From Swiss-Prot, chains A, B:
Assigned keywords, A-Z: Cytosine metabolism, Hydrolase, Iron, Metal-binding, Zinc
Database matches in Gene3D superfamilies: Metal-dependent hydrolases (3.20.20.140), Urease, subunit C, domain 1 (2.30.40.10)
Effect of residue 310 to A: Less than 0.01% of wild-type enzymatic activity
Source organism of the structure: Escherichia coli (strain K12)
Outcome of substituting residue 310 to A: 17-fold decrease in catalytic efficiency with cytosine as substrate and 2-fold increase in that with 5FC as substrate. Shows increased sensitivity to 5FC
Gene: codA
Top-level taxon of origin: Bacteria
Name of the protein: Cytosine deaminase
Cofactor note as given: The purified enzyme contains a mixture of Fe(2+) and Zn(2+) bound in the active site, and a single equivalent of metal is required for full catalytic activity. After removal of the metal, the reconstitution of the enzyme with Fe(2+) gives the highest activity, followed by Mn(2+), and, to a much lesser extent, Co(2+) and Zn(2+).
Regulation of protein activity: Fe(2+)-CDase is rapidly inactivated by H(2)O(2), whereas Mn(2+)-CDase, Co(2+)-CDase, and Zn(2+)-CDase are not inactivated by H(2)O(2). CDase is also inhibited by excess divalent cations. Phosphonocytosine, a mimic of the tetrahedral reaction intermediate, inhibits the deamination of cytosine with a Ki of 52 nM.
Residues that bind Fe(2+): 58, 60, 211, 310
Length: 423, 423
C-alpha cells in the first residue's frame, strides 16, 4: 500500500512537500528542500499540485444523462426542457434513475470528485427517484460520499401534500432539507415554506439547502429569511442558499444592508455558472444581464461561496462532462475574477469552500485526516485552470481510485516537437 | 504519401465517407455503405468528424505570452493591463516578438488551426512588431497561412503620423487595413478615419478589418459607416467589423433598421467571446451586461458572424491555450445558443464562417481543393464541443502536420473501467 506522496506542491505554500500516509490517513506533512527520488510505495506528484478532492455541491442526478430522449431541446429554453422531460416519463423507473446517476458519478470519480450533493425531486407521491438514489448512495460510498437533498421542486405549500412528502423523504434518510420559495404561488407561501423547512431541519437534525431566488426578479428576497432564520437558530454552518441569481438584479443599497446579515448568519452560497449564464437573462432583450449571484463581493466580504455544475447532459443543460475546472473557468469569466491572484485562488471555489458548504468534517491535507487527495499535473491553480488539466491521480483512503494518462500532442515542423501548452 | 481518408463523418451528412487524395489535393469524395478496412496509405478517421481546418480570425500575436512579465495584472482590468505592458517595454524587440508569436502559433498548429489573422500595432514609428511579424508569416507558411492586419491601435487621426504609418505598413506588405473609430478623439475623426481606411484598401487592393465599436456606448455606431462604405464600393466580402460590442447595448428599433444594411452590405462580423465577457460590462455595477454582439440575431438573418480568441496569455486576457472549441464553448453560453442544433451547428462559427471572414479561396472538403483538413474524435459538432476533444490529426497538403494521442482515464471500482465521457 502507498506510504508516501512525494514532490507535491500545495496551494499558497512555497516549495515541495512530502505527505506521509498510514492506516488510510495522513500521518504527517513535511517540507522537502529538493526533489525526492521515487521508490516502492511512493506516489510521485512530480512537482504537480496536490489538493483535497474536488467537490460537487449542487447537481441533479435524478435528471442527468437524459438529453435527447426521446427528443432534443431545440430552442434550449427552460419551457421546452420541461416539455422534453415530460415526453420521457414512461422511461422514468427505479433502474433508469440508478443507471443514469451512476454514469455521471463515474465521470465525477474520473474527475477527482469525492464529495457530491445531489438534489432529488420529492414532489412525487411515489418518491421513485429518491428510493433509487438512496440505494445509489450506499453503492457509491467506497468512492464518493453522496449527500441527498429532499428537493420539493413543485413547492412545499403549492403542491398537494408537499410538506408531508418532504418530511417522508427525511424519514427515509435524505441528508438535507430543500425548498424553492420563489416558485411558491405567493410571497407569503414562500416565507412560510422557509419556516417549515427550518422546523424540519431542527426536528431531524439535518442540513438545509434552498433553491433560493433563482429568478431575475429584483423583488425576490427570500435569502434574507434564510439567513435570518439560520442566525436565530444559531445554525448557519448547516445552511446553504443555492443560486440567489436575483441578487444580480438588486439595487446596491439593499444589497449592502443585506450583506451585514449574510456575514453574521454564517450561511453558505452556491453559484452554478454554466447553468446560470444559460438560463438567466432569458426575459431581457438587449442588453442582457449575466445573472450570477454576487460572487466577487461575497469573497471580498468573507462570505463563503462556491460553484456547482447543477445539471449534466439533460433538458435544462445539454452539455457537461461533470468537470469542476470547467465550471470554475466559466465562473471566473462571468464574475470577472480575472486578475492573476483571483484566478489562482479560484481552486478554493471548487474545493475548500464547497467542503464547508457540505459541512464536511474530514477534509483537507492535514495530519489526522483521511488520505483523500488528488494530484493535478500543473504548477498551481492558475496553471491548472488555464490548461484545463485532467486529474492525474485520485487517492481515497490511501488508495488510487482513478488515474488519467495525459494526452500527447506532437506538431511536425522541420522536426517533430511535443506541445504541452506551457511557455 | 497518404492516398485516402476513410470512415469519415461530415457535418450535416448522413453516414460515412471516403476522401480521395492526389497531388496534395482532394480528388474525389465518395459515400461508403459501411466501415472500410484500414490499409497502407489510408488515414482512418475511425468514424470521427472530418472538417476543413479551424480558423483564428482575430488574435494579437504581437502581445501574446507576456502575462506576468515583469509583473502580473492583479485586478484583471484593462487599465492595469496597459500599465503592466508598459513595464515590459525594455524587452520588446524583433526577436522577442518572433519568439512569442511562434510559441502561440505552435499551439495553434497543435489545435488544428491552419488559417490565422493577427492584428499588429502600427502606432509605432519603428514598426518593430510589424517587421518581426512579416518574417514570422514567411517562416510559418508551410503550416499556417497568416494574414497581418495593420492595426493603428492609438488611432489614425488621433496619433502623430497615424495615417502615414498605416500606409507604410501596407507598403511593407500588411494584408489588411485596420482602424479603431471609437478610440479616436471625436466622432468626426472616427467617421473620417473610416473614409481613409477604405481609400487605402482600394488603393492597395487589401482587405479591411476594423476594431469597431468595442465599447459599452449605445451611441457608438461606427458599424453603419463600415457597412455603408463597403456597400458603396461593392466590396463587402473583403470587409470585417470586429467586436461591435456596442451593438449589445443598442435599442431594438435602431438595430432592426441597421440589420437591413448589414445584410445588404455583405460584410463580416467577428465576436471574441472569451475577451468580450471579461472586458465588457466593466462600468456596470449590478445588473451587469454580457457585452457580446448580436450573434444569434446575425445567424437568424443570414449575416456572416464568427468567433476569435483575441488574446492569449497576455495582460488583457491572462488565459488561453489558443483553442477554438473553448472559444466556441464560451460563445454558445453567453449568446444563449444552447439548443441542440444551435450547439451542433456551432462548428460553423470556427470553420466556414471564419474562412469567409478571411476571404479564403481554397477552403472546404471539396474536390479540387487543397487537402487541408482535420479529424476530431467525436460523432458530430455537439459531441466535439461537449467533450472539448483535441484534434486527432491535422492534414495539410495531404500530409500530417499534427497529431494528438488522446488521454486515457481509468476508474478503479470493483474492476478497472475506462471512462470516455460518452453515455
Ligand atoms: Fe438545482
Ligand atoms: Fe483585437
Ligand atoms: Mg435547476
Ligand atoms: Mg483588443
Amino acid at each position: 500500500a502507498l506510504q508516501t506522496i512525494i514532490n507535491a506542491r500545495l496551494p499558497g505554500e512555497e516549495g515541495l512537500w512530502q505527505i506521509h500516509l498510514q492506516d488510510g490517513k495522513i500521518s504527517a506533512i513535511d517540507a522537502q528542500s529538493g526533489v525526492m527520488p521515487i521508490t516502492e510505495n511512493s506516489l510521485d506528484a512530480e512537482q504537480g499540485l496536490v489538493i483535497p478532492p474536488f467537490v460537487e455541491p449542487h447537481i441533479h442526478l435524478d435528471t442527468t444523462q437524459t438529453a435527447g430522449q426521446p427528443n432534443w431541446n431545440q430552442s434550449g429554453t427552460l419551457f421546452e426542457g420541461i416539455e422534453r422531460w415530460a415526453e420521457r416519463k414512461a422511461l422514468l423507473t427505479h433502474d433508469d434513475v440508478k443507471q443514469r446517476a451512476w454514469q455521471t458519478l463515474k465521470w465525477q470519480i474520473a474527475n477527482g470528485i469525492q464529495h457530491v450533493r445531489t438534489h432529488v425531486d420529492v414532489s412525487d407521491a411515489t418518491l421513485t427517484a429518491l428510493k433509487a438514489m438512496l440505494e445509489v448512495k450506499q453503492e457509491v460510498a467506497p468512492w464518493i460520499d453522496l449527500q441527498i437533498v429532499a428537493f420539493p421542486q413543485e413547492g412545499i405549500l403549492s403542491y398537494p401534500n408537499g410538506e408531508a412528502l418532504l418530511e417522508e423523504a427525511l424519514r427515509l434518510g435524505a441528508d438535507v432539507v430543500g425548498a424553492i420559495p420563489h416558485f411558491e404561488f405567493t410571497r407569503e407561501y414562500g416565507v412560510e415554506s422557509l419556516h417549515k423547512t427550518f422546523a424540519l431541519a431542527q426536528k431531524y437534525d439535518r442540513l438545509i439547502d434552498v433553491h433560493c431566488d433563482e429568478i431575475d426578479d429584483e423583488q425576490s428576497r427570500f435569502v434574507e429569511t434564510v439567513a435570518a432564520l439560520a442566525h436565530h437558530e444559531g445554525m448557519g454552518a448547516r445552511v446553504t442558499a443555492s443560486h440567489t441569481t436575483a441578487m444580480h438584479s438588486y439595487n446596491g443599497a439593499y444589497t449592502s444592508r443585506l450583506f451585514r446579515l449574510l456575514k453574521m448568519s454564517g450561511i453558505n452560497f452556491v453559484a452554478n455558472p454554466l447553468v446560470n449564464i444559460h438560463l438567466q437573462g432569458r426575459f431581457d432583450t438587449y442588453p442582457k444581464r449575466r445573472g450570477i449571484t454576487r460572487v466577487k463581493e461575497m469573497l471580498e466580504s468573507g462570505i463563503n461561496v462556491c460553484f456547482g455544475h447543477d445539471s449534466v447532459f439533460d433538458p435544462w443543460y445539454p452539455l457537461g462532462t461533470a468537470n469542476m475546472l470547467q465550471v470554475l473557468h466559466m465562473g471566473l469569466h462571468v464574475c470577472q475574477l480575472m486578475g492573476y491572484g483571483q484566478i489562482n485562488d479560484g481552486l478554493n471555489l471548487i474545493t475548500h469552500h464547497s467542503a464547508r458548504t457540505l459541512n464536511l468534517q474530514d477534509y483537507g491535507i492535514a495530519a489526522g485526516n483521511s488520505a483523500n487527495l488528488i494530484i493535478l499535473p500543473a504548477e498551481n491553480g492558475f496553471d491548472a485552470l488555464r490548461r484545463q488539466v485532467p486529474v492525474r491521480y485520485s487517492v481515497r483512503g490511501g488508495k488510487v481510485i482513478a488515474s488519467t494518462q495525459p494526452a500527447q500532442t506532437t506538431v511536425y515542423l522541420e522536426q517533430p516537437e511535443a506541445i504541452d501548452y506551457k511557455r
